[PDB]
Design a protein around this ligand. Structure first.
Ligand code: TRP
Length: 521
């Protein structure tokens, strides 16, 4: 009667085929879906399996071997506290290497107080100088030991996500969507966008003559935004005043994994005018220098990038990419919904690209319209997308704002940018000893249901991982702890349990290389 009958997806990369697969599984044979289609590594977050691949019925043992996928236990931040050149290895500060981890999972609590706050109490008490991540996360020792996140037979050990080749994932999903979910793939470019009297898109015209008619249209055309920006004329909110990076130079490097294994984490390596990612996979790693054009020249960044990896810049294939940092004013206008780069983009500092797509796809089915296109459905969708993006945007900027580096104009200028009021409050709260967005559920519920994580994506553990990782600690511990000395004494058993877990994980887990060879061999 009024149900959507036909959906047309413009764009055939990761965003397009994730959208085509998920909507085709959700809607079944009730909707015709057609996609019009005209690697330096990518990292993800743990919810990708339960929200996406589990929805499609795809076990990790099936889709991982077909995309050269590898495991991610954390993001490791390197040289964000010490001045110097852009180098792959961590510098030394206070006898330790200048690195810290941002693992997944939720911190345990004693007395409804996160473990981070007991670590901060012991740092203030002067009885320990251990870093926050090594005291509260057992995953830190495993990643140093380059362990897999699971035993070879599948026994679980630590919360993990995935590194993979985005092109191979897109091809896997295309072969899934077309062979199993009746999604129709159409080659060729888009000649014109047909609109009716109200401005709603009515069909996409190919260069051959074919109208791809539909009731709902999904813009997955990447930075080009052929539908949402060009056709629908929705303006883009440039946010590069707040996040200065807007360029990247990237490549693939073959890696002899038998020398030092395969790191089960994404690296984020501080540079003179930005930061470099390192995304390890079996036999090779993807890497890219993200920098600000306003502080480094193209050739400068290119040479800095090659110098860090010992690459010959004259005989090295390089991707030179310019970024659009920000989001559309509205992600969904009339019957056009933008997903992926067509909607918004942030530098991949905390690996939120696939998550932004997965979240936009989930929220789309939660607000799925009919041909009436009730304004409340797209308004509520746009608010969820807008709040999801701005929250992560402010979180990423705090990595630069809180870093103590002032040695280059770039690092120093980040301290001169306007700090958003809500992040100002979070830093003031953290300094007063308060938790920031402490988790209200256990880890099973958090990762079990997507709406629980969505409403609290960056928890207290994450703000402590970044703030304490960058050397910022509370002015004083949580004041109530000075009234609960028995809690402090009891909570120390939690630190001894982490040390117990660190010993057994290093001593019994297989290497990350061993698991990848079992999975891909
Ligand atoms: N909601 C995410 C938050 C998170 C923790 N550590 C991270 C590292 C990278 C990116 C996101 C995260 C999760 O717990 O899974």
């Amino acid at each position: 009667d009024n149900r959507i009958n036909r959906i047309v997806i413009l764009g055939g990369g990761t965003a397009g085929w994730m959208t085509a697969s998920y909507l085709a599984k959700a809607l079944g044979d009730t909707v015709t879906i057609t996609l019009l289609e005209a690697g330096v590594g990518e990292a993800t977050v743990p919810n990708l399996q339960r929200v996406f691949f589990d929805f499609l019925g795809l076990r990790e043992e099936e889709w991982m071997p077909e995309c050269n996928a590898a495991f991610k236990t954390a993001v490791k931040f390197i040289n964000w506290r010490t001045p110097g050149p852009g180098e792959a290895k961590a510098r030394t500060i206070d006898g330790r290497p200048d690195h810290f981890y941002h693992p997944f999972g939720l911190l345990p609590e004693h007395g409804q107080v996160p473990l981070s706050h007991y670590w901060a109490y012991n740092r203030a008490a002067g009885t320990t100088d251990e870093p926050f991540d090594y005291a509260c996360f057992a995953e830190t020792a495993a990643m140093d030991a380059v362990r897999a996140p699971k035993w070879l037979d599948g026994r679980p050990a630590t919360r993990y996500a995935w590194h993979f080749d985005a092109h191979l994932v897109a091809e896997f999903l295309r072969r899934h969507a077309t062979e199993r979910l009746n999604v129709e793939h159409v080659q060729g470019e888009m000649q014109q966008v047909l609109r009716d009297e109200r401005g709603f898109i009515t069909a996409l015209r190919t260069v051959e003559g074919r109208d791809l008619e539909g009731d709902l249209f999904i813009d997955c055309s990447g930075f080009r935004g052929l539908l949402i920006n060009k056709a629908m004329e929705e303006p883009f909110i440039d946010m590069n005043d707040q996040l200065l990076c807007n360029r990247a130079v990237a490549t693939a490097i073959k890696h002899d994994d038998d020398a030092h294994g395969v790191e089960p984490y994404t690296s984020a390596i501080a540079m003179r005018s930005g930061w470099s990612w390192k995304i390890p996979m079996l036999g090779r790693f993807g890497t890219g220098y993200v920098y600000s054009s306003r502080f480094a020249e193209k050739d400068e960044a290119t040479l800095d990038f090659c110098r860090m990896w010992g690459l010959d810049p004259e005989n090295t294939p390089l991707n030179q990419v310019a970024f659009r940092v920000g989001r559309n004013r509205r992600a969904w206008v009339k019957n056009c919904v933008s997903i992926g780069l067509a909607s918004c983009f942030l530098e991949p500092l905390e690996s939120t690209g696939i998550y932004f797509i997965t979240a936009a796809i989930y929220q789309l089915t939660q607000h799925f319209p009919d041909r009436t296109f009730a304004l409340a459905l797209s308004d509520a969708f746009n608010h969820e997308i807008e709040a999801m993006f701005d929250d992560t945007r402010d979180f990423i900027q705090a990595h630069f704002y809180v870093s103590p580096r002032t040695d280059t104009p770039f690092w120093k200028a980040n301290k001169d940018l306007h700090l958003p009021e809500q992040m100002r409050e979070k830093i003031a709260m953290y300094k007063a000893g308060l938790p920031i967005n402490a988790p209200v559920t256990d880890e099973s519920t958090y990762y079990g249901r997507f709406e629980a994580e969505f409403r609290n994506f960056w928890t207290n553990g994450s703000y402590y991982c970044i703030f304490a990782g960058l050397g910022l600690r509370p002015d004083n511990p949580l004041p109530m702890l000075r009234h609960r000395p028995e809690q402090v004494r009891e909570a120390q058993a939690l630190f001894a349990g982490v040390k117990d877990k660190q010993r057994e994980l290093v001593e019994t887990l297989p290497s990350n290389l061993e698991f990848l060879r079992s999975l891909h061999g």
